[PDB]
Symmetry: D4
Subunit: 153 residues, 8 copies
């Protein structure tokens, strides 16, 4: 699973997290590596899946999403994988995985308001076979943002 990375790969990844739209000319000047080996190394990082893709990181509060929430899901053990497959199709779901501990499934969701949160949980998620329970924790403030998939509804 791990892809071999060297010092130059990590330097490129650091710059492309500073500014995802950085030119390979600018990376080249800053790490004293040829534009050409920069370009080739980025194409390999993408080809290998180290870079899934590039994105605009959106502030959902500024975009008019009032509700960013973490939902902990309890699911029938034999249905956990199928429940994750169904959850992944909703554009409200930003982050989704299977976890150790007291809950089986962990997700982050972004919705416009509390009535949209309740519709999402009770009219969409609750119809998935195998969901026994949900526990929603609503962010009241965010110090460090992750990734929000927004306006895909």
């Amino acid at each position: 699973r791990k892809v071999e990375l060297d010092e130059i790969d990590r330097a490129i990844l650091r710059l492309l997290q500073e500014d995802g739209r950085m030119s390979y000319s600018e990376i080249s000047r800053r790490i004293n590596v040829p534009e050409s080996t920069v370009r080739a190394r980025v194409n390999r990082l993408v080809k290998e899946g180290v870079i899934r893709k590039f994105a605009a990181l959106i502030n959902p509060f500024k975009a008019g999403y009032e509700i960013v929430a973490f939902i902990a899901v309890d699911a029938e053990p034999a249905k956990v994988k199928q429940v994750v497959e169904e959850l992944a199709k909703f554009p409200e779901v930003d982050v989704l995985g299977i976890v150790t501990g007291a809950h089986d499934i962990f997700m982050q969701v972004t919705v416009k308001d509390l009535q949209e949160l309740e519709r999402f949980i009770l009219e969409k998620m609750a119809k998935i076979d195998g969901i026994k329970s949900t526990e929603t924790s609503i962010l009241t403030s965010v110090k460090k943002w992750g990734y929000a998939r927004v306006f895909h509804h």
Copy 2:
């Protein structure tokens, strides 16, 4: 807090989540809007903070990070804000906020292995005044990735 957005702004945001390195020429062709109004609208989205920035979205598993975890933190009520300020300085911390529910603080962290996770929790976080308890849930698989800040240690 909400910034006024129209149909064209949302279209641009959708494309810039598809490919964060999309040229304004390419957005212009795809939404039949001038490169020039595309450029001006993106500069306003960034200026207003709707777009925090652009980034490479990294697969931490492929980058050699074996541990992606959610940590729920219980903190002395009067210290919650100060605890968040201290937590935000660690490059292991990808996502960090204050939440409603049974826990006060929610975060995602990315570390190389279980011994790095324990060092992070017991030799870094545990020295913060006001942390009473931590509960770590380790991702065993991720269906939908968020945002990982990686190689900043």
Copy 3:
């Protein structure tokens, strides 16, 4: 959903929470606004649903109700709305809503004694399809009263 309110509307709402039977003559003298615009503004607040209605606020302990309790209900996710619809028909139920967190449904109930509480939970609520569990917290003292619907059994 929000109804537009100005300074005078809020002043009227403050007085009508001080004394729900306050004459529009008395409100008029106290906020130096005409009885006539007071009357018209109250009719609009009621028409718009800002004022649901006026009520006597009853002390259930003084009325002979010994048990004021909060019940947290866990329900099958797909049945939560239908469970709330059935719960709303009981006159024991004063306050009833859907909530984020560890429980799905939150309610306040008022009953005469512990045997009436057990009959309510086990012979009325428990027959509702979709209720998995109830957790009752009994008020031993009330510092600030809400609203009790009483003698409707």
Copy 4:
């Protein structure tokens, strides 16, 4: 503590919960009891504290309050009474009491938005000596309203 009530008292209480502004003339016609004994019985109910007072029952969502929440508070056992005394002074707090179970103190609060909820919990409640922990459950919908004290901030 219980005040002696008869059939006519309960009939009056039922009507004054139907419409808190009902004339004693109207109650008199509906229960075939003299306006005069109606008036005297209501004055005794108020004098005895059975009727705390009359109020407008406000829909906080329509009044522009987006957040109606139940907060469960864990407090140092020796400080529970003093914590309740301090909590009672905030106009955000609608309902407040001491409870049996896993939490010591139960309250309902009404605030304008999530940032006001966090300020209330972390900059007001958290400064009270003896509060160890809070757990907030946010109403996403209300089927049966209680009592909200609003515009007193």
Copy 5:
């Protein structure tokens, strides 16, 4: 439900808790009341059910019972009463009732050893329709004994 008691009744109850085999002659001397009114008052206390009966209070540890445990039972809400009826038939069960809180049913049991505890829980209680879960808390020491029904197996 409450049976009318006076000063002399309470005095008799105090003495009959000091020594359940106390003669009415001895009670008569100690409270300066006639043996005859003592006898008549005890017959009424028994007839009315204030005194369920008299018993030897046994130390189960000294009787060779190593395990005195409290079991909290979670039951399907619609089956709680029937579950209690079935539980009451086992002679291992000393105390049994329905409770407010996180559990539905509370009991104390006395068994000879850990293998008898597991047989009781898994081969007797677990076959009752409606039991979803049990949580056993084993007494490691008893400061104040209640009542143990022993040698009835």
Copy 6:
């Protein structure tokens, strides 16, 4: 700790749990053992502590106690024994021990009403050094009674 018991001892214990005031004449007739060996065996059971004593078993509901409750206590680990010593002095406390599990101390209490329960928990128990938390479960009905120490306040 275990005291040696034979078939006749167990037979006597069974009868003295049927009726704690049973004459040794009556036990003698029912188990075909001499009154004299019956008497000697009971004196040894008491001397050895197998029989702590005899008591009237009281129905607290009929005696006017409305509240029979189980309280789970969380205590500082180093103070658990001292907390039990202090708890044992209250006549409200019927049963008291140290337990395995999520709570340290388990007790049953009997008080007249909810205001007496709150005074007991907050003005008596809460002043004990080392009590961190209490969780009270109130009996709404009792199928099998234990032992209540009553009228000792």
Copy 7:
């Protein structure tokens, strides 16, 4: 169940826990007991089952197992024994028993990595009839090792 042991048996057991491959010659010299009575006593300890067997105690981390975890299992009460029988067949399971408390079944498992842990829980354990829930706690460091059954997959 207990097998009679004397001073010499316990001395032999202490030495055979120091070094499971200790010669009976070496035990004989160290406890000043004949090789022959040492041999006979060890054969009886094995025959009686006091010594289940001898084993190499393996460090799973050094053997390339990255994941040593404790799994708490919640099971339908009537199926707990059958669930344990099925769990015992997996070579990943090192320690397995039935427990008092909030969980029914407790086990330790050893697997190569997080993806093997998830496959074990979701594709093997989850197919067992009667498993309602699992809670995995992953060891981040071990101060005192138990017993790991390794390379049996």
Copy 8:
């Protein structure tokens, strides 16, 4: 940390878990490898720490230990490592590590009876600085044994 192992190493480890006292002559015959390379490979496994040591695996129930328990420990975050260091010195503690989840520290202990368990928890563990809480789960039956360090008190 991982030590390089081949097919022959794993075969030797499998046999030395079957019988920890197996002669290298017997391993040699069973895997068709020279006694001499068997001996050298075992000396390297021990030298590298893959084999911590060899031991008799004892059945504590047969050895007269009635109580095998798992204890979950909650500790002040800054003291977790020091608490583990102190816990490791007790011979009652068989297995001890730091864990992810709701508890910080996990251990297995073996003691003779319930009074020894309470003395261990309250007079030994509870005196360790930083222990906030313990939760003991007692094994009622063991299907698969781990490792018990016994008679070292």
